Amino acid sequence: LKELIASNPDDLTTELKRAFRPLTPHIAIDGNELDALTILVNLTDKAKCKQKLRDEKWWASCINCVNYRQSHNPKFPDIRSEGVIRTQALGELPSFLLSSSKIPPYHWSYSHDSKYVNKSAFLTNEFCWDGEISCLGELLKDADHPLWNTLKKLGCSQKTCKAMAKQLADITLTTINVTLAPNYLTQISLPDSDTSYISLS
RNA sequence: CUGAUAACUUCACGGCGGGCUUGAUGUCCGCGUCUACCUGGUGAACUGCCGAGUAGGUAG
């Protein structure tokens, strides 16, 4: 919760880059808003000056990263492991069993390949607009949404590139897609009673 | 029916040079240890003989 206090203490550039990457406490983009959304649209290459990253087929590489957001990481710890898993805990746990039902689930991150790491900006970072701690890509998938005339603060995005952001991101955030063969996933089997056995990965 | 099933981290190596802990010093004064104590071998292994013999031998 260090939004403008951490914006200009005159340290260095990458204080913000350490602050959006989800291994840190969040910030809350409420007061100074257009100067922060010009950062995430400029975190793709590795303000308002290094443009032509706005209203092009840039969005074709920008839309492909929202499918791969990975609640759970199927590549841990072996590298070659294809899979997409995004589902919460499915139930509840008692008082003395620590798991990820006991902490809230808001640090999910792109894990597909090497090239699209920087181009997975602008829709996979989390910025706490006024209430909700929320991302940027699970918000711009509807029409009647604020901080979207601030997309028109930049006089570049025509309202036919708005017409794709209407209907591209429609139903995505519940899937599980792993195929057990041929794959490098681990799996075991355990008894559920003295009659059958349940496999689990 | 085990975060399941399989798995060689390896090769080479100079820590070295030099060096003054010193000067001075009063532990002293006094002092009652004492009283009382059963160790218990019955008669029991006795008497000659040779040799000058507190040595040596020898009898039943």
Q: Determine the nucleotide nearest to A197 by Cα–C1' distance.
A: B1
- Element containing residue A17 per DSSP (H, E): helix A17-20
* CA atom of A76 to C1′ atom of B12, Å: 38
Following CA atoms A54, A129, A105, A124 in sequence, which dihedral angle do they give, to the nearest 10 degrees? Answer: 10
Measured CA to CA, the distance from residue A126 to residue A1 in angstroms comes to 12
Asked if residues A81 and A183 have their Cβ atoms less than 8 Å apart, the reply is yes
Could you tell me if A132 and A32 are in contact, meaning their C-beta atoms sit under 8 angstroms apart? no
Element (H, E) at A199: strand A197-200
Report the protein residue whose CA lies nearest the C1' of nucleotide B3.
Answer: A186
The DSSP code sequence of A113-150 is: -SGGGSTT-SSS-B---SSS--BSTTTSSSSS-SS-SS
Distance CA A38, CA A5 (A): 18
**Residues whose C-beta lies under 7 Å from strand B:** A 76-78, 185-191, 197
Rounded to an integer, what distance in angstroms lies between the CA atom of residue A85 and that of residue A69?
A: 8
- Residue A121 CA to residue A45 CA, distance in Å, equals 10
Distance CA A149, CA A25 (A): 28
DSSP letters for A46-106: ---SS-SSSSSTHHHHHHTTTT---SS-TTSS-S----EE----SS---TT--STTSS---
Task: Give the closest residue to A106 by CA, choosing from A151, A147, A71, A59.
Answer: A71
Q: What is the rounded CA–CA span in Å between residue A180 and residue A152?
A: 46
Residue at A60: amino acid letter: A
Instruction: Please name the method used to determine this structure.
Output: cryo-EM
Q: How far is the C-alpha of A95 from the C-alpha of A15, rounded, in Å?
A: 38
Residue A70 φ then ψ, to 5°: 60, 75
Instruction: Indicate the SS3 state at residue A40.
Output: helix
User: Distance (Å) from CA A70 to C1' B30?
Assistant: 96
> In whole angstroms, what is the distance from residue A136 CA to residue A123 CA?
5
Q: How is residue A74 written in tokens?
A: 């199927």
Among all chains, which residue has been given the structure tokens 């640090």?
A107
CA–C1' A94–B39 (A): 87
Closest to A125 (Cα-Cα) out of A27, A50, A22, A36: A22
Task: Decide if A86 contacts A176 (C-beta within 8 A).
Answer: yes
Q: Which nucleotides of B are covered by protein (CB under 7 A)?
A: 1-5
Å: A82 CA to B11 C1': 39
Q: How far is residue A183's CA from residue A81's CA, in Å, rounded to a whole number?
A: 6
Contact A66, A172 (CB under 8 A): yes
Alpha-carbon distance values, A148 to A11, A32, A145 (Å): 31, 15, 6
Tell me how far CA of residue A42 lies from CA of A21, A113, A131, in angstroms: 14, 20, 25
Q: Measuring from the CA of residue A180 to each C1', which nucleotide is nearest?
A: B4
Looking across all nucleic acid strands, the nucleotide with the smallest C1' to CA distance from residue A187 is B4
Q: What phi, psi does A164 have (nearest 5°)?
A: -85, -35
Q: State the resolution, in angstroms.
A: 3.2
Alpha carbon of residue A191 to chain centroid:
37
Q: What angle do CA A170, A54, A5 make, to 5 degrees?
A: 95
Any bridge partners for residue A55, and if so which?
A: none
